[PDB]
Design a protein around this ligand. Structure first.
Ligand SMILES: *C(=N)[C@@H]1CCCN1C(=O)[C@@H]1CCCN1C(=O)CCCc1ccccc1
Length: 710
């Protein structure tokens, strides 16, 4: 099949680094520089063979057409109320960016409030974060260009939707928190740095600061409120307590679910916000997470993992703050993860649990923690919620594998709490009842039972004959829960595919013990789990190695690239999106230093020994057996991915093409596509989202020779 030749790519054989006595060659180190003519020529040469490979088979156009048609349905988010007005996001179906609407009442005529689509032709300027003032009369919103994590914060007066002059630059990984006096807003910014700050640079992000911006002034007048010059990795995010009296500062270092918690009683400020605040260091270590729910006077309710891997609710009274004095308000469940908690209608708590990777939602009494009400749900996920302390109603959104889902509304002023369907839209073309979702638990190599969701047409024979698409992540305490995907359902209905999602270790599905079972020394458990999932699918007759595709993104990109090196015989096709591929150097770039809490760092001899064993970049190797080759591989990245710098994929693909691509037994393609005006994925315009899934499933169809099923 292979009609093209791989590009010439220079190998710098002098690029040799010593890691604790282990010599490491890095002959594509030069691809780390995004601005060189050499790297630009590399990207161009690579896209030049990938694109015509992707678009040769009629199948791309059929998939694209079907994706365009089926994805074109109305998409609503959760209403939420702010001051006198209700807001929601809505996309008519195929707008690049969803639009923010406003109404003066739940029944009232809605109008456009913020439409990002007018800010660019190609929809590559996207909303990233926002915060209303406490009275709902002012509005701050972050804009990101071309997919970058970099943000510019702008402001509007809600009444009349008037643009204000205030502009905040150098915002990244930022809180947005207005003081209740409506005077201004906390946010984070990074000091100036040499070179570019647009998403194409690789420079490490250090010394994040906390500022306060007084509305109606220039950024240069902003007050510095917290900084950690002795700890360049610390990140301090601010929020105001529900009563406006306290600034709560959550300090993070890395990606672990832990934080310091300092507070500032604003009323104790000598003269308002004029400099570094009088922080009281309530929790001054990184031993646990303390996520503010609400407070009453000095009694502060937090969701925590302190002594509770599945999370619980505690009350810490600032006037009596020793741990031995804390009250357990809602104790830890023996198995179920308490995902998030909100306070609504003064004295209700809304708790969301994860029970075997499905959400439940319950109402509890603030005073006692006692359960008052269960909101019934089908099997799936809660993905949107609104209802704050002063609100007297909630909205929440249910989604699953087979339906776009339902937005519920509940008037909490009623004696009987009847949640009612607020929005529900059907996707005609996909009849949910032709398909089934099953959950099974398969043993991993050490015997640990791993959950897996399988979605497939009803009535199929388990004869190994179906193409399968297996998804995984396995990291960072992230739970992979049911979500609605038109793109994956087209693979099912129109490509005859079986979809599967493996809840491997590293995620949050079973609390912190599940997270710890897939990080640091034990990162190999993630790859073992995911390999064992593929083997389950094969052994039970859902698919066969030659028809199996694996997919994951970012940390999941690492997952699938590692599995390709480790078990090339198990997979027919591998699509790795925005993957971390150089595990020896990831910490050097942008925000990579934050991931060491899951991965370790190559500066440590112990950690190096874990990393070198699975680093995708450092484990590309011809399979020993003559009858075994590497799967077809597609790496997807983009030139403004400042989350996972695209050098990871560039170096990885250069290595694959040289070590494996040049062998005579390698007939499967090893390709990269680097998109432009795009980044990690957040805020990607519909047009690109459609191009992307069309590329992926066309790659799959062509490598596995799957006919379209009309
Ligand atoms: C992808 N999956 C990429 C590469 C590995 C980790 N990662 C992430 O995006 C990572 C997973 C959870 C969030 N995250 C970040 O890198 C967030 C960056 C900002 C941040 C915020 C709070 C604390 C530390 C860092």
């Amino acid at each position: 099949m292979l009609s093209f030749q791989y590009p010439d790519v220079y190998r710098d054989e002098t690029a040799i680094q010593d890691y604790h006595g282990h010599k490491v060659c890095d002959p594509y180190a030069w691809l780390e520089d995004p601005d060189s003519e050499q790297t630009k020529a590399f990207v161009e040469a690579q896209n030049k063979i990938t694109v015509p490979f992707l678009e040769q088979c009629p199948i791309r156009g059929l998939y694209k057409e079907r994706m365009t048609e089926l994805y074109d349905y109305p998409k609503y988010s959760c209403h939420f109320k702010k001051g006198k007005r209700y807001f929601y996001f809505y996309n008519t179906g195929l707008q690049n960016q969803r639009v923010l609407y406003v109404q003066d009442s739940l029944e009232g005529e809605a109008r456009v409030f913020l439409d990002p689509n007018i800010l660019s032709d190609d929809g590559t300027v996207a909303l990233r974060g926002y915060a209303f003032s406490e009275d709902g009369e002012y509005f701050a919103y972050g804009l990101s260009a071309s997919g970058s994590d970099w943000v510019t914060i702008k402001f509007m007066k809600v009444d009349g939707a008037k643009e204000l002059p205030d502009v905040l630059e150098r915002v990244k990984f930022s809180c947005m928190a207005w003081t209740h006096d409506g005077k201004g807003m906390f946010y984070n910014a990074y000091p100036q740095q040499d070179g570019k700050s647009d998403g194409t640079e690789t420079s490490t992000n250090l010394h994040q600061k906390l500022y306060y911006h007084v509305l109606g002034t220039d950024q240069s007048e902003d007050i510095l409120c917290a900084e950690f010059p002795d700890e360049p990795k610390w990140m301090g995010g601010a929020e105001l307590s529900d009563d406006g009296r306290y600034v709560l500062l959550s300090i993070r270092e890395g990606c672990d679910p832990v934080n310091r918690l300092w507070y500032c009683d604003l009323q104790q400020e000598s003269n308002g916000i004029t400099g570094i605040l009088k922080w009281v260091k309530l929790i001054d270590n990184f031993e646990g997470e303390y996520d503010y729910v609400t407070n009453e006077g000095t009694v502060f309710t937090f969701k925590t993992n302190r002594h509770s891997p599945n999370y619980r609710l505690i009350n810490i009274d600032f006037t009596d703050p020793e741990e031995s004095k804390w009250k357990v308000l809602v104790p830890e469940h023996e198995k179920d993860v308490l995902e998030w908690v909100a306070c609504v209608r003064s004295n209700f708590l809304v708790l969301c649990y994860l029970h075997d990777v499905k959400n439940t939602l319950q109402l509890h009494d603030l005073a006692t923690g006692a359960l008052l009400k269960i909101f019934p749900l089908e099997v799936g996920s809660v993905v949107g919620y609104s209802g704050q302390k002063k609100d007297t109603e909630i909205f929440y959104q249910f989604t699953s594998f087979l339906s776009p889902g339902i937005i519920y509304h509940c008037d909490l002023t009623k004696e009987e709490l009847e949640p009612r369907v607020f929005r529900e839209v059907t996707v005609k073309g996909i009849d949910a009842s032709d398909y089934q979702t099953v959950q099974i638990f398969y043993p991993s190599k050490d015997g640990t039972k791993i959950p897996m969701f399988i979605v497939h047409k009803k009535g199929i024979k388990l004869d190994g004959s179906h193409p399968a698409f297996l998804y995984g992540y396995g990291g960072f305490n992230i739970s992979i829960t049911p979500n609605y995907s038109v793109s994956r359902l087209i693979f099912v209905r129109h490509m005859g595919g079986v979809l599967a999602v493996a809840n491997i270790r590293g995620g949050g599905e079973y609390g912190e013990t599940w997270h710890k079972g897939g990080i640091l020394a034990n990162k190999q458990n993630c790859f073992d789990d995911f390999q064992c999932a593929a083997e389950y699918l094969i052994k039970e007759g859902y698919t066969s190695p030659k028809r199996l595709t694996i997919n994951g993104g970012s940390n999941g990109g690492l997952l699938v690239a590692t599995c390709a090196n480790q078990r090339p015989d198990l997979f027919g096709c591998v699509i790795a999106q925005v993957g971390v591929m150089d595990m020896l150097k990831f910490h050097k770039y942008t925000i990579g230093h934050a991931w060491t809490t899951d991965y370790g760092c190559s500066d440590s001899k112990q950690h190096f020994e874990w990393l070198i064993k699975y680093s995708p970049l450092h484990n590309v190797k011809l399979p020993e057996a003559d009858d075994i080759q590497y799967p077809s591989m597609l790496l997807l990245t983009a030139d403004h991915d400042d989350r996972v710098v695209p050098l990871h994929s560039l170096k990885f693909i250069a290595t694959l093409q040289y070590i494996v691509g040049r062998s005579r037994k390698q007939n499967n393609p090893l390709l990269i596509h680097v998109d432009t005006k795009a980044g990690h994925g957040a805020g990607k315009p519909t047009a690109k989202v459609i191009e992307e899934v069309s590329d992926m499933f066309a790659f799959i169809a062509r490598c596995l020779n799957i006919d379209w099923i009309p």
